[PDB]
Design a protein around this nucleic acid. Structure first.
Ligand code: YNY
Ligand code: CA
Ligand code: CA
Length: 227
DNA sequence: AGCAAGGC
DNA sequence: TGCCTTTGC
């Protein structure tokens, strides 16, 4: 049972605003991996802000505590709220928090949580500490956990001109033989997105290195008509 | 605004 | 495959 007051207050308030009619289709959207209260993002963020306006944002010493308790609650809105809350502590998040973010990636894993954790929080950390990438990314690739593997792919998603091109292409080469839907998809996504910044090197990579057909199609879908 | 980004 | 709903922007 949760025990930090902020989290109790958020559980009560969210629970009071649940909508069973919305809950079933939302849960089916995540392949019924999670229970849902039935609260979509606009309302969900309104309710979180209510609790902050009342209690004020907890002291930074408790932010791991609070995220952990939210992660253990059964309804998916609490993990999504936990990530909205982590956004409000970005300034105090640093390399000592990488193992905590790993734990979050590998617990209650699905595309909605991992796609929020990785490009923003891990992306930011490794931009400040790129000498730590080698302690984590190779481990994640070798782990055979698809969510850590998608993390290795997507932590650079938002980098644009900051992208470490040879690192990106090494990561993809290590994972291109994956059968996994969420790995193939992530490879096609990061290539398509980086092609908005550096289209010529994405074209050259795709034309000379093996990829799942899904990944290759998605990567070139906006630039193929220039070639 | 409006368009770009899982489900089926 | 490409359109849907929702969220990100
Ligand atoms: C049933 O409803 C839920 O329960 C629920 C839906 C849902 C969604 C989430 C997250 C959730 O938690 C959701 N929950 N979305 C994102 O995380 C996200 C958007 C985004 C945009 C970007 O461009 C502007 C971008 O890059 C810059 C991103 O990367 C950071 C993006 N990420 C989008 C949407 C799910 N969806 C819908 N229709 C499509 N056609 C989609 N194609 C892909 N995904 C789609
Ligand atoms: Ca392997
Ligand atoms: Ca899609």
């Amino acid at each position: 049972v949760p025990m930090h007051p902020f989290v109790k207050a958020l559980q009560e308030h969210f629970t009071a605003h649940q909508n069973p009619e919305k809950a079933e289709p939302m849960a089916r959207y995540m392949k019924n991996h999670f229970l849902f209260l039935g609260i979509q993002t606009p309302e969900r963020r309104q309710l979180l802000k209510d609790i902050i306006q009342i209690h004020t944002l907890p002291d930074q010493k408790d932010f791991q505590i609070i995220i952990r308790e939210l992660w253990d609650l059964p309804e998916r809105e609490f993990q999504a709220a936990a990530l909205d809350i982590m956004q409000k502590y970005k300034k105090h998040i640093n390399e000592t928090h990488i193992p905590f973010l790993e734990e979050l990636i590998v617990t209650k894993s699905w595309w909605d949580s991992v796609d929020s954790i990785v490009p923003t929080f891990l992306g930011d950390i490794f931009l400040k500490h790129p000498e730590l990438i080698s302690a984590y990314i190779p481990k994640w690739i070798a782990s055979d956990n698809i969510w850590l593997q998608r993390a290795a792919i997507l932590f650079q998603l938002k980098y644009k001109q900051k992208m470490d091109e040879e690192l990106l292409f090494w990561i993809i080469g290590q994972l291109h033989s994956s059968k996994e839907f969420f790995i193939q998809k992530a490879i096609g996504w990061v290539l398509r997105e980086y092609a908005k910044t550096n289209p010529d090197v994405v074209w050259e990579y795709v034309q000379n290195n093996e990829l799942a057909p899904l990944s290759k199609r998605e990567a070139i879908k906006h630039i193929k008509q220039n070639y």
